[PDB]
Paper text:
The Rix1 complex of the rixosome utilizes Sda1 as landing platform on nucleoplasmic pre‐60S particles to wedge between the 5S rRNA tip and L1‐stalk, thereby facilitating the 180° rotation of the immature 5S RNP towards its mature conformation. Upon rixosome positioning, the other sub‐module with Las1 endonuclease and Grc3 polynucleotide‐kinase can reach a strategic position at the pre‐60S foot to cleave and 5′ phosphorylate the nearby ITS2 pre‐rRNA.
On the other hand, we observed partial or complete removal of the foot structure in particles prior to 5S rRNA rotation and in the absence of a tightly bound rixosome indicating that C2 cleavage and trimming can occur to some extent even before the rixosome could interact with the pre‐60S and trigger 5S RNP rotation. This could mean that there is no strict sequential order of these events, but that also branching and parallel maturation pathways are possible in principle. While we cannot interpret the significance of this state at present, it should be mentioned that it was only observed with the Rsa4 E117D‐Nop7 split purification.
Numbering used by the authors:
A (entry chain CH): 357 to 477, 482 to 509
B (entry chain CN): 1 to 246
C (entry chain LB): 2 to 98
D (entry chain LB): 148 to 390
E (entry chain CO): 2 to 43
F (entry chain Cb): 2 to 102
G (entry chain LV): 5 to 139
H (entry chain CQ): 1 to 113
The structure:
Amino acid sequence: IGTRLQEVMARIHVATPMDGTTRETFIPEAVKNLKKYDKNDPNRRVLARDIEEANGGAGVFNVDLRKDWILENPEWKYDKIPEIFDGKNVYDYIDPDIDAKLQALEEEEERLEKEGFYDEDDEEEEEILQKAEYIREQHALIRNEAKMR
Amino acid sequence: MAVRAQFENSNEVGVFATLTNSYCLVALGASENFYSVFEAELQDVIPICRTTIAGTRIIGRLTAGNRKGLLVPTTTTDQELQHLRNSLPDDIRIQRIEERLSALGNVIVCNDHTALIHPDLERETEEIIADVLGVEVFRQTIADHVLVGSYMALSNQGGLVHPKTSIQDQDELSSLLGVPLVAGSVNRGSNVIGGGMVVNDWLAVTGLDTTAPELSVIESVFRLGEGAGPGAINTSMKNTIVESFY
Amino acid sequence: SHRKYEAPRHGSLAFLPRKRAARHRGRVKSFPKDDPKKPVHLTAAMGYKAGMTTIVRDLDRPGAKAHKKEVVEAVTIIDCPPMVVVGLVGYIETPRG
Amino acid sequence: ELERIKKYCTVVRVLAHTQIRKTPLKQKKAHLMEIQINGGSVADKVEFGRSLFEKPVTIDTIFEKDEMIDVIAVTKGHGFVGVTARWGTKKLPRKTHKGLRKVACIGAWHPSHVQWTVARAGQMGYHHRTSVNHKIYRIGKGDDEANASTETDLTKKKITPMGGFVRYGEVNNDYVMIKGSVPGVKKRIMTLRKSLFTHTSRKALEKVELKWIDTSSEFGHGAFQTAAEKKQFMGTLKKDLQT
Amino acid sequence: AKSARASRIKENHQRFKKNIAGPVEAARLERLSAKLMAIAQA
Amino acid sequence: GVFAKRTMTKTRRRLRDLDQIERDLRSPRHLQQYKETKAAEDLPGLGLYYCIECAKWFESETSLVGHRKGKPHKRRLKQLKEGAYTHEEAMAAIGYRIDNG
Amino acid sequence: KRGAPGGKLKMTLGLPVGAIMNCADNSGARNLYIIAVKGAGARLNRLPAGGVGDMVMATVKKGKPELRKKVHPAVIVRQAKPWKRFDGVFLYFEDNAGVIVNPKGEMKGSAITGPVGKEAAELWPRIASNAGVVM
Amino acid sequence: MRIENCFFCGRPAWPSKGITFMRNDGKAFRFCRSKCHKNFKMKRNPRKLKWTKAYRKNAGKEMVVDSTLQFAARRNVPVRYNRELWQKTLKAMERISEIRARRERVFYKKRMA
Ligand SMILES: [Zn+2]
């Protein structure tokens, strides 16, 4: 059998699983109840291209990306979602269980304040430091005289 | 239920669309015709999301998913991720992944039960696929191509693979997947099946260039329409296929 | 004899002479054509250029590839404290202008 | 004189001057110009100007955000410039006799003259230019303490960068944000003008939505928008404990 | 290409000016004139 | 000495990075990909003598054992012992992390 | 239809005529020597130049001997000259590289080695289908 | 948009700031400035350059273990948008910033005792 005939036999061959089993399919129930879309029906579903043609055609009509948002509260879908706050990313801090961790942080903070984590703390030492600074100034003046001469 | 369509005069439907059993993703274009094809077929049964991935329109070849979850690459922005999450219901798990091969539509092909991947994905990416998609994952090549997602279209009904895939490979892969497979082409002999079409359990959208014989092969293998089955190919369609593709 | 290879001219003759401006404040050479049916309004203002900066714009431009995307654009800032109106000039129309 | 303007004139212009003392400029002498009143009848223009005597007019009662305007100004001066940078001519080859930043033939044909169309060295820049179709992105208010804040960036900040505008100072008044560039330089008086015609583009009808305004320092590679952000990133310094 | 001085381009621009940009600029002019009359009458 | 030191920092003179060298040392598939990126017949010594640490081809086994006594090879060994700089170290340097569920 | 694609924003062209770039597909060629750029205008003394996503005409200097005697269309997929995208990102790749295609844009080879640019992948859907990494 | 960080030094990278290097293995390197980009092209180690956050962490001069450093992460599982959640997140961001600042000052004093 020539190579071209082998290729067309490979095209007509239908492989099947050896065990004879088949996978479960997940066609939703509304598919059977769908009516077929045809152009000539006066009772068509209005399509996105029909709305675009009615609102200026392609290149003029501005699509609304937030119209099909599925949210908990329907008036939130046109909100301006915050992104930057004080040099930080809001989406990095978005966490569903944020309140529990913030409560834990507050409990740790009050524990540390109770333990004295943030607690902040001699005339002879001040005098010896001032005298040392005077000595360093005199050394600088001596070095400047030497550099001049 | 196989529909010929085009995205801005391009026949590569799988490049611009992702179609599963619970949602459809379409690339945002300058018009609403490509969205309206899917809207006319899927009459609000599953949500259709106009989306952008990494600022591009090749979302079909950059995304992979099934009826349980969606995987997006690492270059997806937070607002695109938020738009996908707000558009899809909570039954679908969305995850952004850190795989080095960011073309997930090229490196992952999956149905609701099993998934084939490029043989060089990371292990962590493999358990992320198996967790979010809820499938079993195999590392496989299709006709010596490692881009299984662009070189195969897969559903729960069946699969269509590269036209130069050998018979032994078809039987082994059909035993691995649990579905019947046919080696066929789209768009007058294009072997990029995954870039050429999108398919779910009850709808396929292929390019406008796809001929009537290969369209009928697609309908038979994916069981689309009344009285469609893979057994028609080697019985009632054998003369047509031999006459066309010899 | 003719020039063998055609090339367009360097520079435009619409901006001659290439000399210093005769004044430092820019001159409004033309005002908008007056329509007596419109309400009264001022046609110009003054400011001082402060510099430039960068923005990120959310773009709604149907047809463009950057539609529904963020674009980075340069802008110029002009400091504009309010002006004070202190006068009124009337103009008649003559066969000399 | 007001009645003479009412009964004899067809064009009415107010005289208006800048309040340059509200600017950071060392100049104390203000700029004065005639601004034409359009609309209405001549009597209406005269009442309008007389009512506007001795009053301050803000920028947002003349122009509005999402409008294209014209900017008229004198450009950056460069002094005496040769033909290569003044006209964009091709440089002559290396070690060309008597100069290579020149034009090889200026008069190779008749008439026995140099023609006015030939590129010559001379003054470049400091030219009067009228540039059109510049979109207003924001008219920010000077009394607004967050006039560089947007709806998605909630940082309360003004338009002035860290360290101020280089060689200008701080913007404490109302400001106009214009897409692109304008003819002048820093500190220079700009004249903003209404467009002479009705616009023909969709860009003029677009609504501008700003997401973010950069306020990092332009005295170098600034990476912080605010001094608080700079302190938060850097941490505690030695001088912080010394103080 | 049709030139910027082409008659068809001019007529297209005139229709745009009359039907599209005209009402927008008219409403903007009404708002601005109302504000500056408020200052003038203040 | 460095050959043509003036244009050393050009992109067309770029050398393999230390993190890629670490990946080549830990995994042979990465090194195999890097070697398939090259043509074996145009390599010094037909590609038979390669130092993974220096990411460099040599003309002979004597030449390779020769460079191993030199200080460039030893500096590469020291840098590999310290560890290459990577994105996870860069992320830990600012205390940032990844939440994958 | 000529080879120049539509809807491409202006970017910096890093590869003039006479540049040799890498061959990023398994067609058998190792490098592509650019002889012309599709869509290049007319200007005195100006070398035609191409950027990422442009179709050029190239000859093969190193590779299989059957490829050496023809002028192939190619698409530039990577460049080393930094360029800006509309999102404000200046970026560059570590090499200049292209893939051999036909005039209609389908690839001659079957796989792309290394990443491709977003411009190339978006303008040419076959390159998008054969790209493992898109950057 | 978002705020990235410099690969080399760790400074905040804002839009249009710096330059990105795309490597053939599939990794991208964002630099905030030409200084970091040129040091990267010269193959300098950020861990040995004392002006980088990498060096400061390796030397132990930045506060690395803290409860306030666990709140910012690359969230790869999106959350459906909720206005109340976003406002309480913003309040959390303010409180976390203040607490982190005081703990950082305590850490510096313990270094400089
Ligand atoms: Zn940096």
